[PDB]
Structures are given as C-alpha cells and as structure tokens.
C-alpha cells in the first residue's frame, strides 16, 4: 500500500476508485471537475498514459501466439494484471494532490471497464453519454483529434462515435448497476443538483454543496486542477450552463440527417430520437438558467 | 513487497540486468547466472522492453511531454509507475532468490535510466562480433522489428547503431555498475570470465555456473522457454561451434565497407577486416565440451 502526505492517505488495489469516461466531447471534463470540487475527491487532469498502457496490454492478450510466449516466460495473466494494477495506481495516486477517494478521467478507459473492474474490485464507473450529434459536431468544429476519426466527415465521425459508445455501453452493462452508472450529459446540464445527488449516492459519497460550485475551486487546494492545453478547459472554468446542448442542430449535412438511423443506431438505443432534429432535452433548473445569465454577463 | 527465508522485492534491491543486441550470447549468460543457487533471471519477459520503449518515446516527443507535464504526469510519476511495473514483472515471473535478474536484450538501451530507477542494480552487456550476430539473425530468421533480414548491410548497420547506444550507456553508468562481457571471451575462457563477472557482481563463486546445462528443468536452476530461439543452443554446454560460422557468408561489398558500416567493430576490438579475427586460444574445458557436442552428448 503506497503512502502520500501533503493526514497520510493509504492507497491500494482494493481502494474505491472512480473511473469517469465516455466518447470525448461528452461532458467528461465537466463531470470530473464537479467531483474534484468535492473536498473528499481528486480526479485531476487526463493522464493519457493509462489508456496507452491499456492498449498495449490489450494487444498482448489479443494475439494467441504472444499470449503463449508470455505464459511460457512465466508472464501469465496474474503477472500482467499485477504489473498493470501497480502501474495504473502509481499514476492515479501521484499525478495530482492526494485525497480520501481517488478518481481518473481518460475518456476511452471506459472501453476497458470490465478489465479495470477486475483489477480494482471496489472501483466504480461513470459512463458520460451525450447525443452523438452533439459530440460529433463538437469534435468537428473544434478540431479535437481522435485516432481513426476523419474530421472532414460527419458520417464517418458519427459512424465511429456509434461504434465507440456501443462498446463502452456493452462494458457498462456487463459490470452492472452497482458498479457502472451511465450519466446523461444533457440531464446533467439541465438538472445538476438532482444529477450529482444521484451520482454521489451511487458512489456512496456523502453529499457536498461544492459539486455545484466547481468554478469557484479552479486552481485551489482540494479544488480543480486544469491543464491549459486540454480542449475542454475554456468550457469547464464556467459554471454548469446551457449553451452547448442543442447548438449542433442545423449544422449536420442533410444526407446524414436523413441516414441518422442507419448511421447511429445507438442514438435510439440510448434514448435520443434519431429523427428528432433536435430532441427536446427538457427544461432547466432555475440554478442553471442563472449560471447561464452569469456567463453572458461575462463574469469569467 | 513479498515475493510469494523471505525475500522482499523493492526499488533498492540488488538486481542484475543482462542484455545486448540479440544473438550475442545473452541467453547463455543468463542461463549461466541462473545456475547459481542465489541468482534467478528466467526467461525473456518481452514486455519490459516494450514499456521502456514507450517511456523512451514520451521523452523525445515535445508535444506529448508537455501534455503529460501539464496533467501532473511528471518524470517523478512516470518513473514511479515504471519502477512498480518492472519490479512486479521481474519479481513475479519466476521462482524467488536472493539476487533477482532480468534478461531482455534491448533493455540495455536504457541502462542509464534503469540504473537511476534501481540504484543498486548492475548491468552485464553482451558484446559479440556484429558479423556473427547478424549472420545468426539472418540464417536462423530471428526477427527484430525494423531489421531487414534480406540485407547483411542493413542488419549490420542497425547492429552498429544498437550497440553504439548500449555501449555509450554502459560507459555513462560507470565501471562499478556496468560490465561489457565479450561473448567470444566467455566461450574461450568460461571460468576466467565467470570469475570476473561474479566478482564484479559482488557474488561468490560456484562451479554450477560452469555446468548450466545440468541444471535445465531443475529447481533453483535454469528455466527455458521452448519458443525462445536460443533454447536449442543453450541446452548444450559452453562450446566453440558458433564463434566464426559467419566467415565467408558476408557479401563482398559488405566485406569492403565493413569499417564504415560497423565502426563499432574496431571500437570494441574486432578488426573489421579480419575474416575472422583470432578471438583467442580455447581453454581445455571448452575444447572438451566442444568434442562432446560433436559426438552427441
């Protein structure tokens, strides 16, 4: 059990970790900011190296032949997993301040939630879900690069968003209700209080009001560390606001609008109507309305 | 911390890294160390070289390093993560012993880094005539990503840069921590060679290092992967057969350009124009071993 000071926090393979993820441009940075604002919880920035080691270890088990040679070298499943456990945990524990509960956010780690679940048996998962039309519009207009995605094409990007979340959602389902919770970005934005109440319950963390005030805790002790070169940063410094839910509408080429159901059958499966262009995401709490007016007033 | 007298594994533990360019006597070396009751190296882990290459990548790349820094994934964190991954693989992939060891050929490209991570580890770098190493990899088809087995010139050129790096790292680590071991000297004089090595390692003599092949399959002994390409050679005792099989198999243009293609040859004492160099005189011990191998013992 490695130890850090900054009382003294003790960390090990059996501690309760929070893993946030989803398809990038789905409100994952917002979600982890809101948790970082809980005084008991640190998520911190995207580590990058964790999904990288996870890809590598994936390749090794994916090839039957490589698996054989590893086994023959005494590098078995148990040895790999122990090395993974140890590697991942150092990065999570030490890449930011220490805190009672530890959290990680690297969006695609969620393609590996059955695995991480196995490695860290008291860790839980928050799968951020957002209308893929919104995420794809986001990745395209902001030019946020994701390996294999062609940013010149909405049809390609939605086709791949579809595949990414189909896999991520299959994983979430497989670990189950107690261990993985899907969180809708739009419901989170319209209804932050109720969302965070339900999220903190699910995680078995006592409520704290500071989850609703993440923007007052940026750069602050026990607060929210932001990398200035992550693409979500300029958005996450503001309070939960409404501007980004629906702005995708009308910026999708007509042919893709038309094929939306062939292209992204995961929309329907997740409760986004593929022919509703846009869906009615619902109605905001006065809290969010006020936050949004503060943003327009220019208090950030 | 515990491997499982109860040895505990940790950053400060005594550790032996064996390596060098593949087909340089690295398996033989580690099998001879494995034979010692107080040492365990075991098979090539394969994944240790991969995580190190990864590490060596995120260093050079500016854009990537800047992103990791700004995320708080600093050198301090990466190094701690690397340390723990490596310790786990090394410690858990074979039986326990007072002195743990790892052989994976290319790890020796990062001996400076590995020495920083494990401040009590030492390094044995295998050195063998590049012409012998290359001819070995071409004729036996031992594949290394990025070496073109269809070209002596290419493989020689990449042996050269590989060993240049490893040797420089060995020099920087210092002579207290890294010992170049010349394959051809180890074969010619096993006992003299192993005497110096063990000394250097601060470990005591044992006649068992001179009889590695009697300890194959046995406990506290030498464990061989049947897929590893060197395995059929390491089952035999230290013998003279493989010293200069390369002679005459080098294309004439590569023979002409040898010093230019492989300046490391002359640097490490191999005359790039001797075909082959005279490596020395064989001990009676390896003369006899050689004689048993030809009859089929």
């Amino acid at each position: 059990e490695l130890v850090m000071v900054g009382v003294e926090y003790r960390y090990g393979k059996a501690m309760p970790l929070i893993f946030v993820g989803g398809v990038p441009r789905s409100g994952t940075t917002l979600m982890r900011a809101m948790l970082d604002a809980h005084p008991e919880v640190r998520c911190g920035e995207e580590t990058r190296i964790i999904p990288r080691v996870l890809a590598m270890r994936q390749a090794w088990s994916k090839s039957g032949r490589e698996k054989l040679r590893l086994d023959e070298a005494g590098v078995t499943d148990e040895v790999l997993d122990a090395a993974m456990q140890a590697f991942i945990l150092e990065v999570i524990a030490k890449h930011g301040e220490p805190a009672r509960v530890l959290c990680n956010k690297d969006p695609f780690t969620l393609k590996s939630s059955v695995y991480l679940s196995r490695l860290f048996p008291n860790s839980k998962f928050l799968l951020m879900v957002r209308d893929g039309r919104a995420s794809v519009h986001s990745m395209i207009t902001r030019k946020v690069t994701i390996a294999g995605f062609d940013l010149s094409s909405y049809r390609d990007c939605l086709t791949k968003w579809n595949k990414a979340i189909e896999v991520m959602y299959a994983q979430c389902m497989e670990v189950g209700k107690e261990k993985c919770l899907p969180v809708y970005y739009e419901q989170l934005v319209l209804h932050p209080r109720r969302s965070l109440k339900l999220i903190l319950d699910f995680l078995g963390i006592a409520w704290s009001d500071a989850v609703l005030h993440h923007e007052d805790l940026i750069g602050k002790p026990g607060g929210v560390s932001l990398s200035k070169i992550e693409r979500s940063t300029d958005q996450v410094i503001k309070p939960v606001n409404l501007e980004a839910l629906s702005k995708w509408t009308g910026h999708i080429p007509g042919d893709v609008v038309r094929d939306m159901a062939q292209i992204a059958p995961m929309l329907a499966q997740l409760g986004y109507d593929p022919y509703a262009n846009p869906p009615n995401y619902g109605n905001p709490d006065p809290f969010v309305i006020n936050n949004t007016q503060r943003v327009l007033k220019g208090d950030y | 911390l515990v491997m499982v007298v109860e040895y505990r594994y940790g950053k400060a533990m005594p550790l032996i890294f064996v390596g060098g360019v593949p087909r340089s006597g690295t398996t033989l070396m580690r099998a001879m160390l494995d034979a010692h009751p107080e040492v365990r190296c075991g098979e090539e882990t394969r994944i240790i070289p991969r995580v190190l290459a990864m590490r060596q990548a995120w260093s050079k790349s500016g854009r990537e390093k800047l992103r990791l820094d700004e995320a708080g994934v600093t050198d301090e964190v990466l190094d701690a993560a690397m340390q723990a991954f490596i310790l786990e693989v090394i410690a858990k992939h074979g039986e326990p012993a007072r002195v743990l060891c790892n052989k994976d050929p290319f790890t020796l490209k990062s001996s400076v880094y590995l020495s920083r991570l494990f401040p009590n580890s030492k390094f044995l770098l295998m050195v063998r005539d590049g012409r012998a190493s290359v001819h070995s990899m071409i004729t036996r088809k031992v594949t290394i990503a990025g070496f073109d087995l269809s070209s002596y010139r290419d493989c020689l050129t990449k042996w050269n840069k590989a060993i240049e790096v490893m040797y420089a790292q060995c020099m920087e680590v210092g002579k207290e921590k890294c010992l170049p071991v010349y394959y051809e000297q180890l074969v010619l004089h096993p006992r003299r060679s192993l005497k110096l090595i063990l000394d250097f390692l601060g470990i005591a003599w044992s006649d068992a290092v001179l009889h590695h092949e009697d300890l194959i399959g046995k406990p506290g002994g030498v464990s061989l992967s049947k897929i590893e390409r060197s395995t059929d050679q390491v089952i035999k005792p230290v013998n003279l057969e493989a010293l200069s099989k390369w002679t005459g198999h080098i294309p004439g243009d590569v023979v002409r350009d040898m010093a230019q293609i492989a300046p490391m040859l002359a640097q490490l004492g191999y005359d790039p124009y001797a075909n082959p160099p005279n490596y020395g005189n064989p001990d009676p011990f390896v003369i006899n071993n050689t004689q048993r191998v030809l009859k089929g013992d």
Partner: peptide
C-alpha cells in the same frame, strides 16, 4: 509525431 488529442480508442 502522430500526436492527437486522444491516441487510443
């Protein structure tokens, strides 16, 4: 060189 905001998916 193959640097992207997300390199593994």
């Amino acid at each position: 060189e193959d640097f992207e905001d997300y390199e593994f998916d």
